[PDB]
Design a protein around this ligand. Sequence first.
Ligand SMILES: O=C(O)C(c1ccccc1)c1ccccc1
Length: 167
Amino acid sequence: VNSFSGYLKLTDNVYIKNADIVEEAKKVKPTVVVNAANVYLKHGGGVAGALNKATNNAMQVESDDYIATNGPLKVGGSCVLSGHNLAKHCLHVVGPNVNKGEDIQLLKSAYENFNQHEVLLAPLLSAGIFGADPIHSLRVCVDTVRTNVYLAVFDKNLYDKLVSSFL
Ligand SMILES: O=C(O)C(c1ccccc1)c1ccccc1
């Protein structure tokens, strides 16, 4: 049993809810929250800017030190950093950004990072300002992630479309 409430069950391991990932993290304090990161860990907009704002910029300060030491992530890659006030850990995952021309085949590699964690609160990778089709992102998630993933979909209209169209 876990703390996640109000989710629709899609498969054995994937759950979905219309919720603001920030407000959900604040309520649950999950072991792992996933950030929709870029390779520079520059949290300016979308899930990254919102999560980072909720940490009072502490996520960005930690991230800048990580990049200064290690250099940029790979598209499809990840790193584990603090969850600050939102979670124990933040798994920063880089999905391909279609609005930068990145290979959508890298979305499966991105979701494979989730398999290193038994339970996660996450957004749909490469959705929103990353430009991918969220229906596609949900299909790759279901077909790739084997651990227990709780997906937060901010947009109520998109959420209802994801549920209604789910095979
Ligand atoms: O739902 C998400 O995953 C994102 C998103 C995507 C598309 C439209 C609105 C919001 C998101 C961005 C910022 C904060 C929370 C959620």
